[PDB]
Structures are given as structure tokens and as C-alpha cells.
């Protein structure tokens, strides 16, 4: 069926499929054990994420997955993205094998690590000290920016950059996921709410939402939303605003308020990312540098 690319091809019998992790518009993701992903260590076990089609995919579903595979091949390797490890295309179902992030997505990461509430009785010397500190939050933002900077350099547009689409490793390294996806930009159900209550329309740049125009600067807009997510510790954007109201508010030029416990430096960058004119928004290179200054100034 598909042609053999020996550079990326990996023997499917060296995979042991484990627990299903979730799914997207096309295909599902399954945790798996891989043996000898590194050819120098043929019997070495590693944990990977395997992308595959659902139980009757159309050929469009297959074409979407193949298209994702080819994007993954060309983009290359970077510390702050989910990297391609190998593929299974011969004699069996199509597998796209990618890096597995131990701690799940950034949204759930932050929400599970919100500071202890006012109802918890003080127990020990760190009763007020939550898992999340400001410099770590800044580092999360900086890493995502560096990852997006890399993707931009490889002429890759994400088109749904959000905390949900950023994954966290065992060492709290941010890795941008699903950057090479066909996302059906000409038939988006703008009112669609996910099973976890997400309204993806709230991450779209105005030119993307209103004009169906995607550039790297539209990703920058989304990054601004992601910044807001980070410093609300996994909050949902435009709180209490349904999609219909979002439409009119965006047309009136409405912007989100400065969230609590968020320094002006970071709300400043959010607002810059939300400039009406895409050219007036910072580039990811500028975002990386701007965030780095803050990160260094607080990393004594
Ligand atoms: C193998 C490590 C692992 O199981 N990690 C993990 C545990 C629990 C929940 C998770 F979401 C993960 C995780 O992030 N798995 C994972 N590793 N690489 C991936 C690449 C894509 C992907 O997609 C699924 C659908 C997904 C996304 Cl994009 C975002 N949030 C959750 C999920 Cl399940 C998941 C992984």
C-alpha cells in the first residue's frame, strides 16, 4: 500500500500496544511499549505514543493520517515539540509513532497543581506553598514560545495552539503536540464544545475566525490565549461568554481582563499578541526573547 521509507520504518512486532490515551477528529492515540527504537540497543524498552486510525476510517481519515506522518518527517527534531520516532506502514495498519509525555497536557497539568484552598488545615511548614511557582510558569510559556519559533522556522502553522495541545514530560519540558494536522478549516463548527467543555473557537485569531486566514501571526494570537491559560493555572478563556457573544465582542474589539496574580509584564505580552493587526503582534522570536528576559530576571 504505502511505500517503504526505511529511514523511519519500524517493525510493528517491536510494539506492544497498551492503554488508549484519547483521540482526535481523525484517528486515536494509544500508549505502547517499544523495543529497540534505538537500533544500538535492540532489546531496550521505551514508552511511546502510537497514532492510528479508528475502526472504520474513510480514506480521507487515512489521507489525513498519512499527511500528518509526512509533516512529522519533514519538521525535524526539537526539544519543545512532540517528535516523530518511527512509522509502521508495511503489512498491517498504519502507525505513526511519536514521543510520549508522561504528565499529560499543560491544561490538566496546571489545574491539578493549583494552590491549596482556604478550607485546608495547615499541616507542616509549606501549607501555603503550592506546586506551581512564578518562574516555572514563565518557563512553561518560554518553552512553548521556543517550540513555536522552531515550527515557524520550518514553515509550520499549528492552527489550534492551546494548553490542551501542549504536553508535559517527566521533567516538565513543554512539547507542542499535533502541529501538523489537517483541521478542516473550511468546515469548523464554531459552536462545537468538546467532551471536556472546550470551545476551540476561543483560541482563533480574528482573521482566522472571520476570514479563514491562517499565518504564523494567527498562531501568535493563540499563544496569547495560551499565556492567559498558564497564568490562570488552566482557566478557560473568555469566562462565562458563549460563542454567540464571543462573535459580537470580538467584532467590538473586546479583550480579556488581566487575570489575578498576573504581573503587568505578562498581561502586556498577552495584549500585544491580541493586537487587531497581525503585523502589530510580536513574532515568536520576539516572544522568546521577551519571555527569556523575564525568566532570567526571576531565576536568581
Ligand atoms: C506514554 C505517556 C503517557 O501516557 N502520557 C499521558 C498520560 C496521561 C494522559 C496523557 F494525555 C498523556 C499524554 O500526553 N500522552 C501522549 N504522549 N504523547 C502524546 C501525543 C499525542 C497525544 O494525543 C492525545 C489525544 C492527547 C492530546 Cl493531543 C492532548 N491531551 C490529552 C491527550 Cl490523550 C497524547 C500523547
Tell me the C-alpha distance between 99 and 48, whole Å. 5
**Experimental technique used to determine this entry:** X-ray
3-class secondary-structure state, position 7:
coil
Tell me the C-alpha distance between 107 and 235, whole Å. 8
Counting ligand 1 atoms within 8 A of each CB, the residue from 25, 29, 53, 172 with the most, and so the one to mutate, is 29
Q: Which three cell numbers stand for residue 106?
A: 499543560
- Residues in CB range of 136: below 8 A, 6 or more apart: 172
3-class secondary-structure state, position 16:
strand
Q: Which three cell numbers stand for residue 246?
A: 464571543
Q: Residue 164's closest CA among 105, 104, 223? A: 105
Task: Kindly give the pairing relationship between strand 84-88 and strand 45-52.
Answer: unpaired
Q: Residue 231's closest CA among 182, 277, 270? A: 270
Q: Residue 98's closest CA among 155, 152, 182, 37? A: 37
Contacts of range 190-195, beta carbons closer than 8 Å, 24 or more positions apart: 190/243, 191/243
- Residues in CB range of 180: below 8 A, 6 or more apart: 67, 68, 71, 72, 75, 156
In the chain, what are the domain boundaries? 2-100, 101-296
Q: Give me the CATH topology for the region 2-100.
A: Phosphorylase Kinase; domain 1 (3.30.200)
Q: Give CA 139 to chain center in angstroms.
A: 15
For residue 31, how far is its CA from the centre of ligand 1 (angstroms)?
8
- C-beta separation of 103 from 168 below 8 A: yes
Q: How far apart are the first and last CA of the chain?
A: 56
DSSP state of 226: H
Counting from 1 in the atom list of ligand 1, the atom nearest the Cα of 108 is 30
3-class secondary-structure state, position 204:
coil
- C-beta separation of 31 from 19 below 8 A: yes
CB-side neighbour CA atoms (13 Å) of 196: 11
Left, alpha or beta for 100 (phi > 0: left; psi -120 to 50: alpha)?
beta
Counting from 1 in the atom list of ligand 1, the atom nearest the Cα of 23 is 25
| CA angle centred on 76, ends 166 and 34, rounded to 5° | 75
Tell me the C-alpha distance between 201 and 192, whole Å. 8
Hey, which residues are catalytic here?
160
List 105's β-bridge partners, or say none: 167
List 35's β-bridge partners, or say none: 45
For 270, phi then psi, to 5°, come to: -55, -50
Instruction: Give resolution, Å, one decimal.
Output: 2.1
Residue where the block lists cell 467590538 = 252
- Name the maximum alpha-carbon separation found in the chain: 63
Tell me the C-alpha distance between 268 and 293, whole Å. 14
Residue where the block lists cell 478563556 = 237
Pocket of ligand 1 (CB under 6 A): 21-24, 29, 31, 47, 49, 82, 98-102, 104-105, 164-165, 167, 177-178
3-class secondary-structure state, position 253:
coil
Q: Count the neighbouring beta carbons within 10 Å of the beta carbon of residue 282.
A: 19
Q: Give CA 53 to chain center in angstroms.
A: 21
DSSP 72-115: HHHH---TTBPPEEEEE-SSSS-EEEEE--TT-BHHHHHHTTPP
Query: Would the CATH topology of 2-100 be identical to that of 101-296?
Result: no
Q: Residue 106's closest CA among 48, 154, 169, 158? A: 169
Query: Which of 2.40.340.10, 1.10.3720.10, 3.40.50.1010, 1.10.510.10 is the CATH number of 101-296?
Result: 1.10.510.10
Task: Kindly give the pairing relationship between strand 166-168 and strand 45-52.
Answer: unpaired
Q: Residue 190's closest CA among 246, 253, 248? A: 246
What's the helix, strand, coil split of the chain in %, to 5?
Answer: 35, 15, 50
Task: Kindly give the pairing relationship between strand 45-52 and strand 95-99.
Answer: antiparallel
- Residues in CB range of 95: below 8 A, 6 or more apart: 10, 12, 15, 50, 51, 52, 87, 88, 89
Task: Kindly give the pairing relationship between strand 95-99 and strand 166-168.
Answer: unpaired
- Residues in CB range of 159: below 8 A, 6 or more apart: 181, 183, 185, 208, 214, 218, 219
Tell me the C-alpha distance between 273 and 281, whole Å. 5
Q: Residue 82's closest CA among 144, 14, 6, 160? A: 144
Name the residue with the closest Cα to ligand 1, atom 19.
100
3-class secondary-structure state, position 218:
helix
Give burial (CB, 10 Å; 0-12/13-18/19+) of 113: middle
* Residue 165 host element (H or E): none
Amino acid at each position: 500500500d504505502l511505500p517503504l521509507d526505511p529511514l523511519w520504518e519500524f517493525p510493528r512486532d517491536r510494539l506492544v500496544l497498551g492503554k488508549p490515551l484519547g483521540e482526535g477528529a481523525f484517528g486515536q492515540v494509544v500508549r505502547a511499549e517499544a523495543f529497540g527504537m534505538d537500533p544500538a540497543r535492540p532489546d531496550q524498552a521505551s514508552t511511546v505514543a502510537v497514532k492510528m486510525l479508528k475502526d472504520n476510517a474513510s480514506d480521507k481519515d487515512l489521507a489525513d493520517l498519512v499527511s500528518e506522518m509526512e509533516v512529522m518527517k519533514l519538521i525535524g527534531r526539537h526539544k519543545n515539540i512532540i517528535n516523530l520516532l518511527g512509522v509502521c506502514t508495511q503489512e498491517g495498519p498504519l502507525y505513526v509513532i511519536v514521543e510520549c509525555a508522561a504528565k499529560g497536557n499543560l491544561r490538566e497539568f496546571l489545574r491539578a497543581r493549583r494552590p491549596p484552598g482556604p478550607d485546608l488545615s495547615p499541616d507542616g511548614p509549606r501549607s501555603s506553598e503550592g506546586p506551581l511557582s512564578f518562574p516555572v510558569l514563565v518557563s512553561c510559556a518560554y518553552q512553548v514560545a521556543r517550540g513555536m519559533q522552531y515550527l515557524e522556522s520550518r514553515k509550520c502553522i499549528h492552527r489550534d495552539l492551546a494548553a490542551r495541545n501542549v504536553l508535559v514530560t517527566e521533567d516538565n519540558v513543554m512539547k507542542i503536540a499535533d502541529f501538523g494536522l489537517a483541521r478542516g478549516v473550511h468546515h469548523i463548527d464554531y459552536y462545537k464544545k468538546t467532551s471536556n467543555g472546550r470551545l476551540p473557537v476561543k483560541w482563533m485569531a480574528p482573521e482566522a475566525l472571520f476570514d479563514e486566514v491562517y499565518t504564523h501571526q494567527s498562531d501568535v494570537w493563540s499563544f496569547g490565549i495560551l499565556l492567559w491559560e498558564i497564568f490562570t493555572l488552566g482557566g478557560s478563556p473568555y469566562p462565562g461568554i458563549p460563542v454567540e457573544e464571543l462573535f459580537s465582542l470580538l467584532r467590538e474589539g473586546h479583550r480579556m481582563d488581566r487575570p489575578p496574580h498576573c504581573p503587568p509584564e505578562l498581561y502586556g505580552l498577552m495584549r500585544e499578541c491580541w493586537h487587531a493587526a497581525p503585523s502589530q503582534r510580536p513574532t515568536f522570536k520576539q516572544l522568546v526573547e521577551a519571555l527569556d528576559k523575564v525568566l532570567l530576571a526571576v531565576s536568581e
